[PDB]
């Protein structure tokens, strides 16, 4: 085996102890008397130091096993920043869920009704894009870290403007950075989705289940795909100190108890610090799932049962030019077995809100070839966005 330190680096081994410490029944004479090093005298050995009163900052780090919440069962945690190696496959397997290509047809009908559009759609959305991508900053070319949250919030406002026509939308409240802890046991492997998502749109009243019974029972017959060499736990956090309690970010008696939509932004400048589109899809699967599982164990309780009343949660995700749409229906609180009814997830993937953007006129042979603005615009993606915002009313 090739070991990975280097002798030159590793903290130097203690100097070989002075020969006078090898002689039985003899007191070595040390410079410890004069409180400083002297040559000619032997090196003193001291007891590990105990400052009888403990200081909070300057003490040695308490070993992990001493904690009250310490447990010997390794628990695999999924937090906001974990990448899954096989994104959607793994996500599904951990979630015990079947994947369906399009969005639910309820949502598509909601999207294609000419009543549900804003005043001038192409105008307003081309403006929200131009704004987020150019006009919102003083600089020539704003970074992604600014413009991704700006565009998601711009679209949230374009949709929010519809509170005039369907005044049920005032039943919602938005929240930022809530503790979410969903513990569940799957196939002898302990899983916990634990952490904070960016932005969470909550509703006062729950969401109507979007799959007919034919879909649920057709889900009873589906076989989960498996990746043999890779364990399904790959990409998570092995953790020995954790709490198992169902926690949604809110205490009892919260006026807006029902999670509606989760928003996941990828704002990082560098490529390698963002998620592959797939890993992002995984992220929002597992987090949607935790969000749902929380409620599902609040309104029913810790017992593992198939659900007579399916819980539905939504999720959206972003490069800021690229959108990931997700709707999740949770049908099952017993994930221990592989063989029962599986939860359902619809994923509309890789929906481009626009092709490319130019913040400066691109000029060829002293003429203006391409003007400032977006190239190509899909009103479709914003249409779906609007739909998912409008799913309550």
């Amino acid at each position: 085996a090739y070991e990975w330190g280097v002798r030159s680096t590793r903290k130097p081994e203690p100097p070989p102890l002075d020969r006078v410490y090898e002689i039985p029944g003899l007191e070595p004479i040390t410079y410890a008397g004069k409180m400083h090093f002297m040559p000619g005298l032997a090196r003193p050995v001291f007891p590990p130091w105990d400052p009888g009163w403990t200081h909070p900052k300057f003490r040695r780090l308490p070993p992990l096993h001493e904690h009250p919440l310490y447990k010997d069962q390794a628990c695999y945690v999924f937090h906001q920043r974990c990448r899954l190696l096989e994104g959607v496959k793994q996500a599904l397997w951990l979630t015990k869920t079947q994947l369906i290509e399009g969005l639910p047809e309820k949502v598509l009908r909601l999207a294609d009704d000419p009543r549900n559009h804003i005043e001038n759609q192409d105008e307003r959305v081309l403006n929200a894009i131009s704004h987020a991508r150019l006009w919102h900053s003083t600089e020539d070319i704003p970074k992604r870290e600014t413009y991704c949250p700006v565009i998601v919030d711009s679209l949230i406002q374009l949709c929010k403007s519809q509170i005039l026509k369907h005044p049920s939308l005032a039943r919602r409240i938005c929240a930022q950075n809530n503790t979410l802890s969903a513990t569940w046991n799957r196939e002898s492997i302990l899983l916990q989705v634990h952490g904070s998502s960016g932005a969470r749109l909550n509703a006062k009243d729950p969401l109507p289940p979007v799959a007919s019974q034919e879909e649920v029972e057709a889900t009873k017959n589906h076989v989960l795909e498996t990746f043999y060499p890779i364990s399904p736990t790959m990409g998570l956090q092995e953790c020995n100190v954790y709490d198992v309690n169902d926690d949604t970010g809110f205490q009892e008696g919260y006026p807006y108890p029902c999670p509606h939509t989760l928003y996941f932004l990828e704002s990082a400048n560098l490529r390698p610090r963002r998620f592959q589109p797939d890993q992002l899809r995984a992220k929002m699967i597992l987090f949607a799932f935790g969000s749902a599982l929380a409620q599902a164990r609040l309104l029913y309780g810790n017992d593992s049962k198939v659900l007579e009343q399916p819980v539905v949660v939504q999720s959206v995700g972003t490069d800021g030019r690229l959108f990931q749409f997700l709707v999740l229906q949770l049908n099952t609180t017993d994930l221990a077995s592989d063989e029962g009814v599986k939860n359902l997830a619809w994923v509309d993937s890789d929906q481009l809100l626009y092709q490319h953007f130019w913040c400066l006129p691109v000029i060829k042979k002293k003429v203006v070839v391409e003007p400032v603005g977006p190239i190509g615009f899909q009103p479709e993606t914003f249409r779906k966005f609007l739909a998912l915002y409008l799913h309550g009313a």
């Binding site: 704004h131 006009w135 003083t138």
Partner: protein, 339 residues
């Protein structure tokens, strides 16, 4: 060239007078004269708004669980920021049922407002340019918690030539003794958005007071009156800048002055306490040459500070003030005139 950077949120003792000075602003206590021309609009539900606001307050101060803070000092910045964001976003829609303009509005979240202007003269004290004559320059870099931007302008609170007995305070000192410091970097006039944006006008601003300026801290420093001053100053700066920039987006500047008064509104808040300000910018020419014969002034009306709630306890909001809601409602009910 070299300019003074004016901070809207200030530790300096009386920054209200100084800022009035820099801006040529007159301050009048109490809200602007009520536009009795209002239609019988207020069909408003005060109970749905009590509810809607207390949802925010309670969500922040009680319900929502944050990853545990070791300080336990409970930074009022970290508590009140999401409260204010949620307050604006919530009231915006609820009152957007009544006031359709707020539907077409843009909501700005912590984004820069920059204004740069010239005021007065100076004989340069030191250096190789000592003795020559130069203008005093000022820059305000501001970051309001929230803005509301519209496609059409709000109406004037008083006419353009409206006159007042009260005179703009003339400081005898350099700005330096405020304290204020010179620095130089790019001078920007920026509204919260670039020129190319179709929404050119301001509605109201929301300023959350930073941690240093808490009523408690000031009470410890043997500063009583200052509690008020800090609010004033903030408004007088921010609003001015905003208005100023708006004006200069319309092509107006020191030698074009201004044809129609530019107005905007603002709310300044320690998480508990609120204050309401209205600002009318008339004169854009504060320049040495341009201010010689110029009669006009900029006017700023403001409210005494005042508590929203009293002592949230365990998912109950104990004291509550509807007057505060009513003024917030006033401001959010303003509209462009219709043709």
């Amino acid at each position: 060239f070299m300019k003074y950077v004016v901070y809207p949120q200030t530790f300096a003792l009386n920054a209200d007078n100084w800022y009035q000075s820099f801006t040529k602003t007159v301050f009048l206590s109490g809200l602007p004269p009520t536009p009795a021309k209002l239609e019988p609009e207020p069909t408003l539900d005060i109970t749905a708004l009590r509810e809607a606001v207390c949802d925010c307050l309670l969500q922040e101060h009680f319900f929502l669980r944050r990853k545990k803070r070791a300080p336990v000092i409970q930074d009022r910045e970290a508590i009140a920021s999401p409260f204010l964001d949620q307050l604006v976003a919530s009231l915006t829609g609820l009152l957007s049922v009544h006031n359709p303009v707020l539907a077409a509005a843009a909501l700005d979240c912590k984004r820069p407002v920059h204004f740069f202007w010239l005021r007065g003269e100076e004989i340069i004290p030191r250096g190789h340019r000592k003795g020559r004559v130069d203008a005093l320059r000022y820059q305000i870099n501001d970051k309001p918690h929230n803005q509301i931007r519209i496609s059409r302008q709000l109406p004037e609170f008083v006419p353009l030539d409206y006159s007042i007995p009260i005179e703009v305070p003339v400081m005898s000192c350099k700005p330096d003794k405020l304290p204020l410091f010179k620095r130089q970097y790019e001078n920007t006039i920026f509204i919260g958005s670039k020129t190319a944006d179709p929404l050119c006008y301001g509605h109201t601003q929301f300023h959350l007071l930073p941690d240093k300026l808490k009523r408690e801290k000031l009470l410890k420093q043997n500063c009583a009156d200052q509690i008020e001053v800090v609010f004033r100053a903030n408004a007088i700066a921010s609003l001015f800048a905003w208005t100023g920039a708006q004006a200069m987006y319309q092509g107006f500047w020191s030698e074009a002055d201004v044809t129609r008064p530019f107005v905007s509104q603002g709310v300044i808040t320690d998480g508990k306490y609120f204050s309401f300000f209205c600002y009318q910018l008339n004169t854009l020419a504060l320049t040495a040459q341009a201010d010689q014969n110029n009669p006009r002034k900029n006017i700023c009306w403001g409210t005494q500070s005042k508590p929203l709630y009293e002592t949230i306890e365990d998912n109950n909001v104990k004291g509550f003030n509807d007057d505060v809601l009513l003024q917030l409602v006033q401001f959010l009910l303003n509209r462009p005139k219709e043709d």
